Amino acid sequence: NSVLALHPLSLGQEYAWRLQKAADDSTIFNNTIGMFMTGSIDAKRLSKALRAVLRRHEIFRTGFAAVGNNADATSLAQIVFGRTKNKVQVIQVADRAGAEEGYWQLVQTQYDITAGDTLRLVDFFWGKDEHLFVVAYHRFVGDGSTTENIFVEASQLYGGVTLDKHVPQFADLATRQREALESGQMDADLAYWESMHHQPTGVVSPVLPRMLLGEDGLNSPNHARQPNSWKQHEAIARLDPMVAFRIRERSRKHKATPMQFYLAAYHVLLARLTGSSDFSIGLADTNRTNVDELAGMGFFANLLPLRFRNFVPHITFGEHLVATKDKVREAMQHARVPYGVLLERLGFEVPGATAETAEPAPLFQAVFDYKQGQAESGSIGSAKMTEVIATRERTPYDVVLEMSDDPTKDPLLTVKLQSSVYEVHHPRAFLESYISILSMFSMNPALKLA
């Protein structure tokens, strides 16, 4: 079928392509989100809805092709096809265990991105109107907001809504961002981040120490980082609803947001466990800043590398909360820079997910990713969502805290630690310490940091 247009990779796609190239096996960069739901969904109506979502958005009918014959891989470009090459499936399984098996197969799926095979949209169904609806995506075509948008579009279409004819297409938006960089309009943002991260001429960027969790412990393991293709151990917990309540109250009274409270508390725990007084945390940000960016599909998400440097343990948590609020507000004035272009400017190498190296991530080794959506805004037909299973791509970061704060549930916390550094029980030990520290500070923000 037809090729409509060709485009360069977006800035974010381009850095992601370098990560993928450096990895032994890019299957580790698959993303797979399963939503368990209970209730009637008509297969034909759902599949028609999802087919229309595929047709609407160019990025869901995009392939990614080599430029030249022996770059070898120096350029990839987006090829926008007239019609999608992705498919929708509605699959009968025996029972929930069958559905879960299908899910974990989708986690290992081989995307043929050259051919525009970039998404899986699968409704596994069993029993009395039970479902597991899975959205799986190659890195280049999606992100958490895109997954929300798919559910919401599919729900509305299923329910007979006529979506707007106007669709903000990914390449159009990505080109505007590239032009802003080329034309010098990101230069002030770049200088902000470059100055934040500048070092004395000697001195290597400090990297986060190993956290003392520990496997018990007394007397440090202090062993070499063991190459593991960025395999992560994880643990997940729901936060007590009274702790969440106190956090909302004390955040408001400090003129801060709950996100800033969670981030501040994460920083304090990292400082405690490492003994570092100067390290950075990558703050996840959607990088969607206007109506069209919010409605669009594709890979927009970014990381903002906050440096927490001149650390003072005797200030109160309340004081630290306010200072962290100001740090985030300042960062958000300079949020448009894709972190890979900063990294390149600062001279970093692309990290490799392999069996022969396990180097810390460039610039920052901790990430914080907080989102507040309502899952139920994308409920479909008469099915109600009960539970999400999420398997996002591997990343190089030593410690990652991902949270959902759906205003109609309790906050859900996920901690991921690199297996190259940490043991199988360490994510839970960190998560327990974090919940403790949230409970203590939200009870009494006058307490000192350490």
GROMACS .gro file of C-alpha atoms in nm:
model
  450
    1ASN     CA    1   0.000   0.000   0.000
    2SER     CA    2   0.079   0.366  -0.024
    3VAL     CA    3   0.354   0.566   0.141
    4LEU     CA    4   0.220   0.908   0.230
    5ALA     CA    5   0.533   1.076   0.360
    6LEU     CA    6   0.879   1.039   0.508
    7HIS     CA    7   1.011   1.217   0.821
    8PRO     CA    8   1.315   1.220   1.043
    9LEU     CA    9   1.288   1.052   1.384
   10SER     CA   10   1.174   1.283   1.661
   11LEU     CA   11   1.448   1.386   1.901
   12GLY     CA   12   1.316   1.137   2.163
   13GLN     CA   13   1.287   0.859   1.903
   14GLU     CA   14   1.643   0.923   1.792
   15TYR     CA   15   1.798   0.883   2.139
   16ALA     CA   16   1.583   0.578   2.200
   17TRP     CA   17   1.708   0.432   1.870
   18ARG     CA   18   2.067   0.473   1.995
   19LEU     CA   19   1.976   0.289   2.317
   20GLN     CA   20   1.815   0.013   2.115
   21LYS     CA   21   2.118  -0.020   1.888
   22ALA     CA   22   2.356  -0.043   2.183
   23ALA     CA   23   2.154  -0.323   2.349
   24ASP     CA   24   2.220  -0.693   2.287
   25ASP     CA   25   1.845  -0.760   2.252
   26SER     CA   26   1.600  -0.479   2.200
   27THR     CA   27   1.308  -0.700   2.314
   28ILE     CA   28   1.387  -0.555   2.660
   29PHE     CA   29   1.245  -0.221   2.536
   30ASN     CA   30   0.899  -0.358   2.473
   31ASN     CA   31   0.613  -0.198   2.670
   32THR     CA   32   0.305  -0.393   2.769
   33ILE     CA   33   0.005  -0.265   2.970
   34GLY     CA   34  -0.278  -0.505   3.064
   35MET     CA   35  -0.609  -0.390   3.207
   36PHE     CA   36  -0.832  -0.652   3.369
   37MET     CA   37  -1.198  -0.562   3.323
   38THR     CA   38  -1.526  -0.726   3.401
   39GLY     CA   39  -1.841  -0.674   3.199
   40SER     CA   40  -1.989  -0.694   2.854
   41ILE     CA   41  -1.779  -0.588   2.554
   42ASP     CA   42  -1.896  -0.671   2.206
   43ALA     CA   43  -1.600  -0.804   2.003
   44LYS     CA   44  -1.703  -0.665   1.668
   45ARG     CA   45  -1.773  -0.318   1.809
   46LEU     CA   46  -1.448  -0.309   2.004
   47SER     CA   47  -1.242  -0.428   1.710
   48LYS     CA   48  -1.404  -0.167   1.484
   49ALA     CA   49  -1.327   0.101   1.742
   50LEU     CA   50  -0.965   0.002   1.773
   51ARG     CA   51  -0.925  -0.023   1.394
   52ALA     CA   52  -1.046   0.339   1.372
   53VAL     CA   53  -0.788   0.447   1.630
   54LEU     CA   54  -0.521   0.279   1.417
   55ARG     CA   55  -0.644   0.461   1.105
   56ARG     CA   56  -0.675   0.803   1.275
   57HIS     CA   57  -0.317   0.834   1.390
   58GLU     CA   58  -0.024   0.838   1.154
   59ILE     CA   59   0.214   0.714   1.425
   60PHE     CA   60   0.013   0.388   1.434
   61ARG     CA   61   0.069   0.346   1.059
   62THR     CA   62   0.435   0.428   1.072
   63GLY     CA   63   0.733   0.214   0.989
   64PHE     CA   64   1.095   0.284   1.063
   65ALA     CA   65   1.341   0.218   0.782
   66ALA     CA   66   1.714   0.238   0.735
   67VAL     CA   67   1.841   0.536   0.540
   68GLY     CA   68   2.122   0.439   0.305
   69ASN     CA   69   2.261   0.089   0.257
   70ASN     CA   70   2.560   0.101   0.496
   71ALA     CA   71   2.508   0.368   0.763
   72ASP     CA   72   2.498   0.109   0.890
   73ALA     CA   73   2.240   0.239   1.137
   74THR     CA   74   2.327   0.609   1.122
   75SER     CA   75   1.980   0.708   1.011
   76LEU     CA   76   1.640   0.561   1.060
   77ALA     CA   77   1.342   0.751   0.924
   78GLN     CA   78   0.968   0.736   0.981
   79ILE     CA   79   0.767   0.606   0.688
   80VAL     CA   80   0.401   0.702   0.709
   81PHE     CA   81   0.182   0.453   0.531
   82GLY     CA   82  -0.166   0.523   0.397
   83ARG     CA   83  -0.298   0.225   0.593
   84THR     CA   84  -0.195   0.062   0.920
   85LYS     CA   85   0.009  -0.255   0.938
   86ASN     CA   86  -0.098  -0.315   1.295
   87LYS     CA   87  -0.377  -0.556   1.387
   88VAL     CA   88  -0.646  -0.591   1.649
   89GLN     CA   89  -0.716  -0.927   1.810
   90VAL     CA   90  -0.998  -1.052   2.022
   91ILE     CA   91  -0.883  -1.383   2.168
   92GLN     CA   92  -1.077  -1.644   2.363
   93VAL     CA   93  -0.878  -1.803   2.647
   94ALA     CA   94  -0.967  -2.076   2.893
   95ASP     CA   95  -0.944  -1.867   3.208
   96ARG     CA   96  -0.748  -1.591   3.374
   97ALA     CA   97  -0.427  -1.799   3.376
   98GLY     CA   98  -0.464  -1.827   2.996
   99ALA     CA   99  -0.500  -1.449   2.969
  100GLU     CA  100  -0.190  -1.393   3.185
  101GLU     CA  101   0.003  -1.637   2.971
  102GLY     CA  102  -0.095  -1.440   2.660
  103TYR     CA  103   0.013  -1.117   2.834
  104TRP     CA  104   0.360  -1.249   2.913
  105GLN     CA  105   0.393  -1.369   2.551
  106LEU     CA  106   0.319  -1.009   2.439
  107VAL     CA  107   0.596  -0.892   2.672
  108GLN     CA  108   0.834  -1.099   2.456
  109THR     CA  109   0.688  -0.994   2.124
  110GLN     CA  110   0.921  -0.920   1.829
  111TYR     CA  111   0.812  -0.589   1.673
  112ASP     CA  112   0.902  -0.572   1.301
  113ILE     CA  113   0.926  -0.191   1.304
  114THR     CA  114   1.062  -0.177   0.950
  115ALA     CA  115   0.727  -0.308   0.832
  116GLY     CA  116   0.520  -0.087   1.064
  117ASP     CA  117   0.457  -0.365   1.315
  118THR     CA  118   0.470  -0.150   1.627
  119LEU     CA  119   0.160  -0.218   1.845
  120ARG     CA  120  -0.045  -0.501   1.989
  121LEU     CA  121  -0.409  -0.441   2.077
  122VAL     CA  122  -0.556  -0.756   2.229
  123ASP     CA  123  -0.877  -0.833   2.418
  124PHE     CA  124  -0.823  -1.167   2.593
  125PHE     CA  125  -1.165  -1.292   2.710
  126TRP     CA  126  -1.301  -1.580   2.919
  127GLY     CA  127  -1.568  -1.679   3.166
  128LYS     CA  128  -1.865  -1.456   3.219
  129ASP     CA  129  -1.763  -1.129   3.050
  130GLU     CA  130  -1.411  -1.135   3.188
  131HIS     CA  131  -1.134  -0.955   2.997
  132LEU     CA  132  -0.770  -0.862   2.991
  133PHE     CA  133  -0.731  -0.579   2.741
  134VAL     CA  134  -0.369  -0.529   2.649
  135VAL     CA  135  -0.201  -0.236   2.483
  136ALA     CA  136   0.153  -0.321   2.387
  137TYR     CA  137   0.388  -0.085   2.208
  138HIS     CA  138   0.732  -0.044   2.070
  139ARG     CA  139   0.907   0.251   2.236
  140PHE     CA  140   0.893   0.462   1.924
  141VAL     CA  141   0.506   0.478   1.901
  142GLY     CA  142   0.380   0.520   2.254
  143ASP     CA  143   0.403   0.623   2.620
  144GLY     CA  144   0.181   0.637   2.929
  145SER     CA  145  -0.028   0.927   2.794
  146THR     CA  146  -0.068   0.757   2.461
  147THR     CA  147  -0.199   0.445   2.635
  148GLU     CA  148  -0.454   0.661   2.821
  149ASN     CA  149  -0.550   0.829   2.494
  150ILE     CA  150  -0.603   0.490   2.318
  151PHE     CA  151  -0.841   0.368   2.591
  152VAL     CA  152  -1.030   0.698   2.588
  153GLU     CA  153  -1.065   0.709   2.208
  154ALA     CA  154  -1.164   0.344   2.190
  155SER     CA  155  -1.423   0.387   2.466
  156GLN     CA  156  -1.581   0.691   2.302
  157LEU     CA  157  -1.587   0.524   1.959
  158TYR     CA  158  -1.736   0.208   2.103
  159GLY     CA  159  -2.002   0.425   2.266
  160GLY     CA  160  -2.087   0.587   1.932
  161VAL     CA  161  -1.912   0.925   1.981
  162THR     CA  162  -1.787   1.105   1.673
  163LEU     CA  163  -1.435   1.219   1.748
  164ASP     CA  164  -1.307   1.548   1.609
  165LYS     CA  165  -1.188   1.529   1.248
  166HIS     CA  166  -0.878   1.729   1.340
  167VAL     CA  167  -0.597   1.496   1.457
  168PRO     CA  168  -0.264   1.628   1.572
  169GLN     CA  169  -0.021   1.398   1.401
  170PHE     CA  170   0.308   1.290   1.563
  171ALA     CA  171   0.549   1.390   1.285
  172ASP     CA  172   0.404   1.742   1.268
  173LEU     CA  173   0.455   1.789   1.642
  174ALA     CA  174   0.799   1.623   1.644
  175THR     CA  175   0.918   1.848   1.359
  176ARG     CA  176   0.817   2.160   1.548
  177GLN     CA  177   1.025   2.046   1.840
  178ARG     CA  178   1.327   1.971   1.621
  179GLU     CA  179   1.293   2.314   1.454
  180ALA     CA  180   1.287   2.484   1.795
  181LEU     CA  181   1.620   2.317   1.880
  182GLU     CA  182   1.776   2.399   1.539
  183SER     CA  183   1.657   2.761   1.543
  184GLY     CA  184   1.809   2.830   1.884
  185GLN     CA  185   1.488   2.847   2.075
  186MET     CA  186   1.592   2.575   2.319
  187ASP     CA  187   1.923   2.748   2.382
  188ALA     CA  188   1.817   2.915   2.709
  189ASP     CA  189   1.674   2.585   2.839
  190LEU     CA  190   1.990   2.404   2.742
  191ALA     CA  191   2.203   2.663   2.924
  192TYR     CA  192   1.988   2.619   3.235
  193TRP     CA  193   2.046   2.245   3.244
  194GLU     CA  194   2.408   2.271   3.136
  195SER     CA  195   2.489   2.519   3.409
  196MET     CA  196   2.307   2.306   3.670
  197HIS     CA  197   2.521   2.005   3.578
  198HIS     CA  198   2.853   2.178   3.516
  199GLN     CA  199   3.150   2.050   3.715
  200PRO     CA  200   3.496   2.190   3.807
  201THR     CA  201   3.742   2.110   3.531
  202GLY     CA  202   3.887   1.807   3.712
  203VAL     CA  203   3.585   1.646   3.826
  204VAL     CA  204   3.366   1.363   3.704
  205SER     CA  205   2.993   1.390   3.755
  206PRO     CA  206   2.928   1.207   4.085
  207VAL     CA  207   2.719   0.894   4.057
  208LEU     CA  208   2.473   0.771   4.312
  209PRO     CA  209   2.633   0.540   4.571
  210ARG     CA  210   2.506   0.194   4.646
  211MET     CA  211   2.217   0.214   4.893
  212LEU     CA  212   2.256   0.029   5.220
  213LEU     CA  213   1.936  -0.169   5.241
  214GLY     CA  214   2.091  -0.420   5.270
  215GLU     CA  215   2.087  -0.795   5.209
  216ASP     CA  216   2.089  -0.791   5.588
  217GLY     CA  217   2.318  -0.631   5.658
  218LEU     CA  218   2.653  -0.562   5.826
  219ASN     CA  219   2.984  -0.511   5.646
  220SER     CA  220   2.936  -0.410   5.284
  221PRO     CA  221   2.910  -0.640   4.988
  222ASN     CA  222   3.070  -0.371   4.779
  223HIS     CA  223   3.083  -0.606   4.480
  224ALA     CA  224   3.126  -0.517   4.117
  225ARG     CA  225   2.819  -0.423   3.920
  226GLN     CA  226   2.724  -0.745   3.739
  227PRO     CA  227   2.622  -0.700   3.368
  228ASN     CA  228   2.258  -0.802   3.339
  229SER     CA  229   2.112  -0.618   3.035
  230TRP     CA  230   1.945  -0.375   3.281
  231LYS     CA  231   1.732  -0.645   3.435
  232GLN     CA  232   1.536  -0.504   3.732
  233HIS     CA  233   1.393  -0.648   4.050
  234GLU     CA  234   1.070  -0.485   4.166
  235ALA     CA  235   0.814  -0.457   4.437
  236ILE     CA  236   0.473  -0.293   4.439
  237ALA     CA  237   0.249  -0.163   4.722
  238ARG     CA  238  -0.060   0.045   4.782
  239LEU     CA  239  -0.021   0.333   5.017
  240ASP     CA  240  -0.246   0.351   5.325
  241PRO     CA  241  -0.534   0.591   5.259
  242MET     CA  242  -0.478   0.788   5.579
  243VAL     CA  243  -0.114   0.846   5.484
  244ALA     CA  244  -0.231   0.966   5.141
  245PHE     CA  245  -0.482   1.196   5.310
  246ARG     CA  246  -0.219   1.349   5.539
  247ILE     CA  247   0.006   1.404   5.243
  248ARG     CA  248  -0.270   1.593   5.057
  249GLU     CA  249  -0.339   1.805   5.367
  250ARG     CA  250   0.020   1.894   5.452
  251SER     CA  251   0.103   1.956   5.081
  252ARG     CA  252  -0.179   2.206   5.053
  253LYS     CA  253  -0.081   2.382   5.372
  254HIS     CA  254   0.273   2.426   5.238
  255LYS     CA  255   0.136   2.546   4.902
  256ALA     CA  256   0.288   2.238   4.740
  257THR     CA  257   0.145   1.941   4.550
  258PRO     CA  258   0.135   1.577   4.665
  259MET     CA  259   0.377   1.497   4.379
  260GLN     CA  260   0.630   1.732   4.530
  261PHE     CA  261   0.586   1.568   4.872
  262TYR     CA  262   0.646   1.221   4.728
  263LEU     CA  263   0.955   1.352   4.537
  264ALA     CA  264   1.095   1.529   4.839
  265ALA     CA  265   1.053   1.222   5.055
  266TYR     CA  266   1.216   1.005   4.785
  267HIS     CA  267   1.512   1.241   4.775
  268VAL     CA  268   1.546   1.228   5.156
  269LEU     CA  269   1.544   0.849   5.159
  270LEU     CA  270   1.800   0.828   4.880
  271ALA     CA  271   2.026   1.069   5.066
  272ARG     CA  272   1.987   0.868   5.388
  273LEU     CA  273   2.059   0.533   5.230
  274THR     CA  274   2.355   0.646   5.015
  275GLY     CA  275   2.519   0.914   5.229
  276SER     CA  276   2.545   1.136   4.922
  277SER     CA  277   2.489   1.511   4.947
  278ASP     CA  278   2.497   1.573   4.569
  279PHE     CA  279   2.306   1.355   4.327
  280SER     CA  280   2.039   1.387   4.061
  281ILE     CA  281   1.692   1.252   4.010
  282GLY     CA  282   1.532   1.222   3.669
  283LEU     CA  283   1.179   1.355   3.702
  284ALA     CA  284   0.949   1.202   3.445
  285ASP     CA  285   0.745   1.457   3.252
  286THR     CA  286   0.490   1.403   2.976
  287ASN     CA  287   0.624   1.695   2.770
  288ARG     CA  288   0.267   1.768   2.660
  289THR     CA  289   0.212   2.139   2.695
  290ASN     CA  290  -0.097   2.232   2.488
  291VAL     CA  291  -0.425   2.097   2.362
  292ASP     CA  292  -0.281   1.926   2.058
  293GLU     CA  293   0.014   1.773   2.244
  294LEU     CA  294  -0.222   1.631   2.503
  295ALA     CA  295  -0.451   1.472   2.238
  296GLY     CA  296  -0.177   1.332   2.016
  297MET     CA  297  -0.046   0.977   2.000
  298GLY     CA  298   0.318   0.878   2.011
  299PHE     CA  299   0.634   0.893   2.221
  300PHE     CA  300   0.649   1.237   2.388
  301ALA     CA  301   0.763   1.147   2.741
  302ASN     CA  302   1.081   1.294   2.880
  303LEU     CA  303   1.304   1.307   3.188
  304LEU     CA  304   1.418   1.627   3.365
  305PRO     CA  305   1.746   1.585   3.548
  306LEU     CA  306   1.702   1.760   3.880
  307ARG     CA  307   2.026   1.805   4.074
  308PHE     CA  308   1.990   1.800   4.452
  309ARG     CA  309   2.329   1.935   4.553
  310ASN     CA  310   2.404   2.140   4.864
  311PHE     CA  311   2.234   1.898   5.107
  312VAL     CA  312   2.151   2.008   5.463
  313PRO     CA  313   2.017   1.739   5.701
  314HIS     CA  314   1.898   1.970   5.982
  315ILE     CA  315   1.628   2.155   5.787
  316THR     CA  316   1.272   2.038   5.847
  317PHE     CA  317   1.076   1.831   5.597
  318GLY     CA  318   0.834   2.120   5.558
  319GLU     CA  319   1.120   2.349   5.456
  320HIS     CA  320   1.252   2.084   5.217
  321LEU     CA  321   0.906   2.042   5.068
  322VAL     CA  322   0.880   2.409   4.989
  323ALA     CA  323   1.232   2.415   4.844
  324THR     CA  324   1.153   2.107   4.637
  325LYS     CA  325   0.835   2.273   4.515
  326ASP     CA  326   1.042   2.574   4.395
  327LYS     CA  327   1.299   2.341   4.230
  328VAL     CA  328   1.026   2.164   4.034
  329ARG     CA  329   0.853   2.486   3.931
  330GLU     CA  330   1.185   2.618   3.802
  331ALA     CA  331   1.256   2.293   3.616
  332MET     CA  332   0.911   2.314   3.455
  333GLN     CA  333   1.004   2.646   3.298
  334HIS     CA  334   1.274   2.460   3.105
  335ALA     CA  335   1.097   2.130   3.047
  336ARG     CA  336   1.099   2.121   2.663
  337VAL     CA  337   1.449   1.985   2.621
  338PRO     CA  338   1.455   1.611   2.535
  339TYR     CA  339   1.707   1.467   2.786
  340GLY     CA  340   1.902   1.279   2.513
  341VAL     CA  341   1.998   1.610   2.353
  342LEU     CA  342   2.128   1.732   2.691
  343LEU     CA  343   2.322   1.414   2.743
  344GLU     CA  344   2.486   1.452   2.400
  345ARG     CA  345   2.569   1.813   2.464
  346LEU     CA  346   2.730   1.723   2.794
  347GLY     CA  347   2.948   1.462   2.623
  348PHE     CA  348   2.801   1.141   2.757
  349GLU     CA  349   2.817   0.802   2.590
  350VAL     CA  350   2.497   0.609   2.512
  351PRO     CA  351   2.464   0.339   2.777
  352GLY     CA  352   2.448  -0.026   2.665
  353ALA     CA  353   2.215  -0.291   2.795
  354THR     CA  354   2.443  -0.592   2.751
  355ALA     CA  355   2.595  -0.897   2.920
  356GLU     CA  356   2.948  -0.737   2.921
  357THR     CA  357   2.893  -0.394   3.085
  358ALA     CA  358   2.675  -0.262   3.368
  359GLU     CA  359   2.781   0.104   3.384
  360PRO     CA  360   2.560   0.346   3.573
  361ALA     CA  361   2.328   0.557   3.364
  362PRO     CA  362   2.468   0.892   3.242
  363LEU     CA  363   2.411   1.202   3.457
  364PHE     CA  364   2.148   1.061   3.691
  365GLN     CA  365   2.096   0.712   3.835
  366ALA     CA  366   1.760   0.760   4.006
  367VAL     CA  367   1.422   0.834   3.845
  368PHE     CA  368   1.088   0.947   3.985
  369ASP     CA  369   0.773   0.905   3.773
  370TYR     CA  370   0.440   1.023   3.913
  371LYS     CA  371   0.106   1.025   3.735
  372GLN     CA  372  -0.245   1.126   3.851
  373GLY     CA  373  -0.488   1.008   3.577
  374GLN     CA  374  -0.818   0.834   3.631
  375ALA     CA  375  -0.789   0.483   3.484
  376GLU     CA  376  -1.170   0.463   3.467
  377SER     CA  377  -1.194   0.754   3.216
  378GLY     CA  378  -1.105   0.485   2.953
  379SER     CA  379  -1.367   0.224   3.061
  380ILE     CA  380  -1.518   0.041   2.766
  381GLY     CA  381  -1.877  -0.063   2.714
  382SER     CA  382  -2.011  -0.221   3.030
  383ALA     CA  383  -1.677  -0.349   3.143
  384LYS     CA  384  -1.526  -0.199   3.457
  385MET     CA  385  -1.155  -0.207   3.523
  386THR     CA  386  -1.033  -0.383   3.827
  387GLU     CA  387  -0.653  -0.415   3.804
  388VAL     CA  388  -0.357  -0.314   3.583
  389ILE     CA  389  -0.044  -0.519   3.503
  390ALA     CA  390   0.233  -0.299   3.365
  391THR     CA  391   0.563  -0.405   3.216
  392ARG     CA  392   0.749  -0.100   3.086
  393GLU     CA  393   1.082  -0.118   2.905
  394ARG     CA  394   1.400  -0.173   3.101
  395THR     CA  395   1.607   0.134   3.175
  396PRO     CA  396   1.964   0.179   3.300
  397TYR     CA  397   1.874   0.355   3.625
  398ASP     CA  398   1.986   0.212   3.964
  399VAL     CA  399   1.657   0.301   4.134
  400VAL     CA  400   1.324   0.392   3.986
  401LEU     CA  401   1.012   0.489   4.178
  402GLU     CA  402   0.696   0.493   3.963
  403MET     CA  403   0.367   0.599   4.125
  404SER     CA  404   0.005   0.625   4.021
  405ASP     CA  405  -0.218   0.856   4.224
  406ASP     CA  406  -0.565   0.795   4.073
  407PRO     CA  407  -0.790   1.028   4.278
  408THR     CA  408  -1.053   0.759   4.318
  409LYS     CA  409  -0.813   0.488   4.444
  410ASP     CA  410  -0.511   0.485   4.682
  411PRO     CA  411  -0.165   0.563   4.550
  412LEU     CA  412   0.018   0.269   4.391
  413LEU     CA  413   0.395   0.258   4.435
  414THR     CA  414   0.638   0.055   4.224
  415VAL     CA  415   1.011   0.040   4.308
  416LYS     CA  416   1.259  -0.107   4.057
  417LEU     CA  417   1.626  -0.175   4.136
  418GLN     CA  418   1.901  -0.288   3.898
  419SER     CA  419   1.979  -0.662   3.952
  420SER     CA  420   2.339  -0.567   3.864
  421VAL     CA  421   2.367  -0.395   4.199
  422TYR     CA  422   2.075  -0.511   4.416
  423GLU     CA  423   1.918  -0.830   4.542
  424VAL     CA  424   1.571  -0.973   4.489
  425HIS     CA  425   1.446  -0.859   4.835
  426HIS     CA  426   1.588  -0.506   4.813
  427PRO     CA  427   1.302  -0.338   4.623
  428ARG     CA  428   1.061  -0.436   4.901
  429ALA     CA  429   1.306  -0.315   5.168
  430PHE     CA  430   1.330   0.025   4.991
  431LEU     CA  431   0.956   0.045   4.943
  432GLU     CA  432   0.896  -0.033   5.311
  433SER     CA  433   1.144   0.237   5.417
  434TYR     CA  434   0.982   0.483   5.179
  435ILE     CA  435   0.633   0.415   5.310
  436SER     CA  436   0.767   0.458   5.663
  437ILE     CA  437   0.927   0.790   5.577
  438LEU     CA  438   0.607   0.915   5.407
  439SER     CA  439   0.407   0.816   5.709
  440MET     CA  440   0.648   0.989   5.950
  441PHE     CA  441   0.687   1.317   5.760
  442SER     CA  442   0.321   1.344   5.673
  443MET     CA  443   0.242   1.297   6.047
  444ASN     CA  444   0.504   1.559   6.142
  445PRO     CA  445   0.666   1.788   5.882
  446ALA     CA  446   0.863   1.965   6.154
  447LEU     CA  447   1.095   1.667   6.179
  448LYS     CA  448   1.449   1.711   6.045
  449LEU     CA  449   1.570   1.536   5.730
  450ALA     CA  450   1.836   1.327   5.910
   0.00000   0.00000   0.00000
